[PDB]
A paper describes a structure:
TRPV1-TRPV4 are non-selective cation channels which play important physiological roles in sensing noxious heat, maintaining cardiac structure and maintaining skin, hair and bone physiology. A distinctive feature of TRPV1 and TRPV2 is their permeability to large organic cations, such as the cationic dye YO-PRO-1 and the sodium channel blocker QX-314. The non-conducting structures of TRPV1 and TRPV2 possess two restrictions, one at the selectivity filter (SF) and second one at the intracellular mouth of the pore (termed the common gate). Our data shows that binding of RTx induces C2 symmetric conformations in TRPV2, but the extent of C2 symmetry depends on the environment in which the channel is reconstituted.
Classification of the TRPV2RTx-APOL sample revealed the presence of four classes: one low-resolution (~7 Å) class, which was excluded from further analysis, and three higher resolution classes which are representative of three different conformations. These include one C4 symmetric and two distinct C2 symmetric classes refined to 2.9 Å, 3.3 Å and 4.2 Å, respectively. Unexpectedly, the transmembrane domains (TM) of the three structures obtained from amphipol-reconstituted TRPV2, TRPV2RTx-APOL 1-3, show similarity to our previously solved cryo-EM structure of TRPV2 in its apo form (TRPV2APO) and adopt non-conducting conformations. While fully bound to RTx, the TM domains of TRPV2RTx-APOL 1 and TRPV2RTx-APOL 2 structures largely retain C4 symmetry. However, the TMs of TRPV2RTx-APOL 3 exhibit a slight departure from C4 symmetry in the pore. The effects of RTx on the TRPV2RTx-APOL are particularly obvious in the ankyrin repeat domains (ARD) of the two-fold symmetric TRPV2RTx-APOL 2 and TRPV2RTx-APOL 3 which display pronounced broken symmetry and a range of rotational states. Instead, RTx only effects changes in its immediate binding site above the S4-S5 linker and in the parts of the channel not bound by amphipol, strongly suggesting that the polymer constricts the TM and prevents conformational changes at the S4-S5 linker and the ARD from propagating to the TM domain. The fact that the TRPV2/RTx complex is stabilized in multiple distinct closed states with different arrangements of the ARD assembly suggests that the conformational changes in the ARD might represent low-energy, pre-open states that can be achieved without substantial changes in the TM domains. Nevertheless, the RTx-induced conformational changes in the S4-S5 linker are not efficiently propagated to the TM in the TRPV2RTx-APOL structures, and they fail to open either of the two restrictions in the pore. As observed in our previous study, RTx assumes different binding poses in subunits of the C2-symmetric structures, both in the amphipol and the nanodisc samples which may lead to the distinct conformations observed in these channels.
Author numbering:
A (entry chain D): 132 to 413, 427 to 459, 464 to 558, 586 to 726
B (entry chain C): 525 to 558, 586 to 655
C (entry chain A): 263 to 393
D (entry chain A): 656 to 726
Write the structure that this text describes.
């Protein structure tokens, strides 16, 4: 009851700065206002009453409680309409849009650049209860924006990074709203906000068109490039399998199979030349000088290509494993030929080390096939995860027992390294244990060898059952989707061209008139066709088609 | 039935990967060792003996580059243990997620 | 469900009949209140009930879980640490750790007021562990 | 959870102190007034703050709060 007479009193006194537009002053709670409180407390009547007296509906609540990544904070954006949208209050959003005094604007964006659609992207994590809220409020705000301001396209407005809500949902890793936005069908009042159409439906077969406005890799800063090279989430291999993306990447791979085979044969010919030059090193001196020159050129080529990769689209151990191994082999090759040109005589271990490393890098090209590509994915995952803690524990046990046997044996076990070598021979199955008959302390040496053998059998058995428990309690589609993500990164690399000659890339998909716009010229969109077959289509209603007869 | 399905499916890609690793390391040891490892075949035979459990490794004390030979042998042993471990868990991922009526 | 229903009913009835006496303070001859007994004997369901307990308008002081504020979906909930804290002698944490003999000890450490408190102790004691 | 129990035993042992220096232990959590008792003075309890995020809060009934603004 006290609100209306108090505002009448504050208007009667004649202040220069009003009471109803009041901002909190603290650093933790800066810029907060009574309108944010009224929207938080779910009271529509107090919102109407504060609006009619003249509350600022674009008040930017920029406090430290209202920022993104601080602990136990609520990031809704700054504006009141973004708060009303995030807090599931539909009638408050409706009144704030359609009031006669001081209308809230959908184009209005916060200090971080985010509009209300970006905020609805940011709040989503995972549930039915969060996801249904976010998709319903997203669709409702788009339809309300088409009603109130038809010329503005609300999904075009970017953040301060330069991202639209679709690119933001791709980067932050939100699967549910990204999957909703890519395939979105609207009805007869406003159908031009759709991204999915049906071109024709002759019986059970039909042809669905998908829009590729920001999805195609032809335009810079795509969705495909953001999933491949800019997203940091562990959701990245799941987002590649979705409905317009899988067929598009399969089409690009089927276009680019010949260049993959050509790059394979070029690398194989390089490694055979490098093998013959490292074998015949020790007339023929002319052919060996030509061979050394070709190896130096190949090393400079691979080194510059990998440096251009790391400069261009990076800034990350498991994701960039292949590029690291190619970089090490290239640097060791160039360094070894520099030392052979200067004759520093240490060129031969670097030469054979880069030779072995270059032959074992031939498993990069086994990702063209599924049957062996998933196998090399598993080799990466075994080397990076499960081998290193085993080596940690094993080297602790090994050098503890080595120093014990060196110091207890006062010709057997002369030094720490020569005792480590015999204790490592026990692991292979080549090591010798016996009753020495010359040492004074024979029984203790034999007891320590028996204990070492039992402990390392325990360690190997543990490693095996740890891998079995990790693999048997795992989803089958994960290895398949990691392989698909590797192919997607590979096809986006082959599309960009070689480093010495940048390629002129082409659009994908046909250009056709999808409909009429609200104003003037008809809607003209680049679309990608996916054929579909469904046998329950006789029950549901027939959708509107762009064409009549299948072509 | 299981013998045929093990031979045709699992063993051949393992042999592919293993022979790539094997002959890469064999040519490296032949060229690095300037009486040990006299030829490509005679060094491939020793690196294959390491898989049986019969293979001899030592600090050679006559070659100039002893430590690099020892380091390459240690790396070969770890990589082949990784490959056999992978083959085993790949068969277990095929066999755990299968219907029991199918072999019958 | 029987034990939690009758436990709450007895607390409300004793709060009505004899208000000054607190029933949950009276110890056994072993020295234990019912929360320490539920922690010691290994009973997960009633221990989990007592640690997060909310009562209503007639008898509100019998709760052990309070909400300090709720701004939208976020809230800060206040949990009482009367016998849970390791400052006092013969705690619930000491009884779960040492004096319990059940096979259910490791399941009782993961409960909602305990997980955050033990993480907040471990993040403070990291440097002495490295030392 | 077995590993969490191991860290719990470790943090109790480090909190108790060494044998040669019996360390003085400190209370955890803030002390604040929760409400009034049925007899006389208000209740002052030592409490531990746990933050939570819940999107089912709108359909349910709103609980009693001890403070007004999030501070
Ligand atoms: C960067 C890492 C992690 C790495 C660099 C080198 C030292 C490496 O040893 C490891 C660790 C290691 C050490 C000792 C024995 C085995 C493995 O594994 C690779 C790394 C592991 C091997 C095995 O080859 C692979 O990893 C398969 C592979 C290669 C290239 C790829 O692009 C690839 O992608 C699928 C997979 C290659 C080596 O370079 C090699 O052949 C020699 C001489 C040593 C290998 O270190």
């Amino acid at each position: 009851a006290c609100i209306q007479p108090l505002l009448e009193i504050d208007r009667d006194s004649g202040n220069p700065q009003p009471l109803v537009n009041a901002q909190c002053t603290d650093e933790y709670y800066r810029g907060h206002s009574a309108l944010h409180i009224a929207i938080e407390k779910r009271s529509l009547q107090c919102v109407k009453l504060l609006v009619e007296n003249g509350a600022n509906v674009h008040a930017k609540a920029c406090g430290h409680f209202f920022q993104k990544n601080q602990d136990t904070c609520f990031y809704f954006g700054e504006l009141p309409l973004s708060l009303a949208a995030c807090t599931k209050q539909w009638d408050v959003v409706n009144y704030l849009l359609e009031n006669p005094h001081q209308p809230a604007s959908l184009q209005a964006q916060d200090s971080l650049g985010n509009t209300v659609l970006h905020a609805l992207v940011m709040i989503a994590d995972d549930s039915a209860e969060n996801s249904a809220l976010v998709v319903r409020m997203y669709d409702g705000l788009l339809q309300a924006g088409a009603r109130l301001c038809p010329n503005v396209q609300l999904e075009g407005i970017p953040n301060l990074e330069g991202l639209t809500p679709l690119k933001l949902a791709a980067k932050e890793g939100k699967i549910e709203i990204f999957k909703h936005i890519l395939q979105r069908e609207f009805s007869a009042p406003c159908q031009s906000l759709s991204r999915k159409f049906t071109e024709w439906c002759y019986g059970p077969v039909r042809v669905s068109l998908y829009d590729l406005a920001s999805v195609d890799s032809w335009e810079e800063n795509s969705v495909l490039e953001i999933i491949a090279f800019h997203s940091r989430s562990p959701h990245r291999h799941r987002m590649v399998v979705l409905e317009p993306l899988n067929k598009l990447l399969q089409a690009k791979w089927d276009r680019l199979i010949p260049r993959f085979c050509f790059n394979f044969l070029c690398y194989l010919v390089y490694m055979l030349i490098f093998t013959a030059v490292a074998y015949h090193q020790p007339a023929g001196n002319s052919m060996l000088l030509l061979g050394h020159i070709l190896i130096l050129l190949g090393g400079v080529y691979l080194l510059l290509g990998q440096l251009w990769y790391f400069w261009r689209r990076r800034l990350s151990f498991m994701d960039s494993y292949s590029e690291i191994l190619f970089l090490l082999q290239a640097l060791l090759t160039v360094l070894s030929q520099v030392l052979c040109f200067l004759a520093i005589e240490w060129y031969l271990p670097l030469l054979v080390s880069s030779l072995a490393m270059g032959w074992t890098n031939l498993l990069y090209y086994t990702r063209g096939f599924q049957h062996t590509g998933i196998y090399s994915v598993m080799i990466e995952k075994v080397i990076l995860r499960d081998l290193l803690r085993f080596l940690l524990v094993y080297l602790v046990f090994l050098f503890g027992f080595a120093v014990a046997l060196v110091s207890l044996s006062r010709p057997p076990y002369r030094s720490i390294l020569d005792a480590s070598l015999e204790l490592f021979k026990f692991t292979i199955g080549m090591g010798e244990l016996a009753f020495q008959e010359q040492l004074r302390f024979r029984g203790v040496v034999l007891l320590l060898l028996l204990a070492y053998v039992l402990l390392t059998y325990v360690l190997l058995l543990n490693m095996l059952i740890a891998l079995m428990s990790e693999t048997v309690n795992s989803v089958a589609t994960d290895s398949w989707s990691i392989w698909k993500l590797q192919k997607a990164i590979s096809v986006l690399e082959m599309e960009n061209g070689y480093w010495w000659c940048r390629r002129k890339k082409q659009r994908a998909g046909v250009m056709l008139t999808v409909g009429t716009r609200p104003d003037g010229s008809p809607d003209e969109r680049w679309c990608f066709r996916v054929g579909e077959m469904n046998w329950a289509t006789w029950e549901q209603t027939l959708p509107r088609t762009l064409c009549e007869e299948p072509s």
